[PDB]
């Protein structure tokens, strides 16, 4: 029992995925706004709004993030040629989502140091099906729930660690939860 909802709403790309539709409700709202509520400490979900294709852009986000347990708030996206999955993690709960990734330095931008990591996913699900691909992570030290993200600064930092990002696929400001509860409303511009 899985559910994936993607498209364009309010003039923005949106994406919402869950493996337990009964414990999470995603609401597409006006312009770049979305809400999510999750409850029952059951299921994995990721959802939010942004762009497809992504770019080196400034992502402004404003809202309220009220998690309880394992959850994060991140700019999240993909490239192809090469296939890359990336995360700019602005806030997280009781689990650091980069756990197990390899430390790869620091970038200071938008009012915080971010710790950089890289990792490899082997024979794993992706936007292209089962693939082996690289991940990049920037994890914000100064956790926050509103601000602006200079994605180009991160992309540049990652390009000084390993292979560079490819041609952009989707790019969203996402809320994720894993067997937890919470709610959030975010507006992306």
Residue numbers in the entry: 5 to 193
What do the authors report?
Endo-β-1,4-xylanases (EC 3.2.1.8) of the GH11 family are capable of hydrolyzing β-1,4 glycosidic bonds between two D-xylopyranosyl residues linked in xylan polymers. Two highly conserved glutamates at the active site of GH11 xylanases trigger the hydrolysis of β-1,4 xylosidic linkages in xylan. In the first step of catalysis, the acid/base residue E180 (numbering to NhGH11) acts as an acid and protonates the xylan, while the other catalytic residue E89 acts as a nucleophile that provokes the departure of the leaving group to form a α-glycosyl enzyme intermediate. In the second step, the acid/base residue E180 act as a base and deprotonates the neighboring nucleophilic water, which attacks the anomeric carbon of the α-glycosyl enzyme intermediate and allows the product formation with β-configuration.
To study the structure function relationship of a new xylanase from the GH11 family the crystal structure of N. haematococca xylanase (NhGH11) was determined and refined to atomic resolution (1.0 Å). The overall 3D structure of NhGH11, consisting in total of 193 amino acids, is displayed in a single domain with β-jelly roll folding. Overall, the three-dimensional structure resembles a right hand with the fingers represented by two antiparallel β-sheets and a thumb loop located between strands β10 and β11. The inner antiparallel and highly twisted sheet creates a well-structured cylindrical cavity where xylan substrates bind and catalytic residues E89 and E180 are located. The catalytic residues E89 and E180 are located in the cleft with a side chain distance of ~ 10.5 Å. Inside the active site the carboxyl group of E89 (OE1) is hydrogen bonded to nitrogen (NE2) of Q139, hydrogen (HG3) of F137 and a water molecule (W49), while the second oxygen of the carboxyl group (OE2) is forming a hydrogen bond to Y80. The second catalytic residue E180 is forming hydrogen bonds to two water molecules via oxygen atoms OE1 and OE2 of carboxyl group, E180 strongly bends towards the main chain because the oxygen atom OE1 is forming a hydrogen bond with the main chain nitrogen of S75. The crystal structure refined with anisotropic B-factors to 1.0 Å resolution allowed to investigate hydrogen atom positions involved in main-chain interactions, side-chain interactions and even alternative conformations of amino acid side chains. A calculation of solvent accessibility shows that NhGH11 contains seven buried water molecules. NhGH11 is a mesophilic xylanase that can catalyze the efficient breakdown of xylan-based substrates at an optimum temperature of 45 °C and a pH of 6.0, and due to broad applications of its hydrolytic products NhGH11 can be considered for a wide range of corresponding industrial processes performed between 40 and 50 °C.
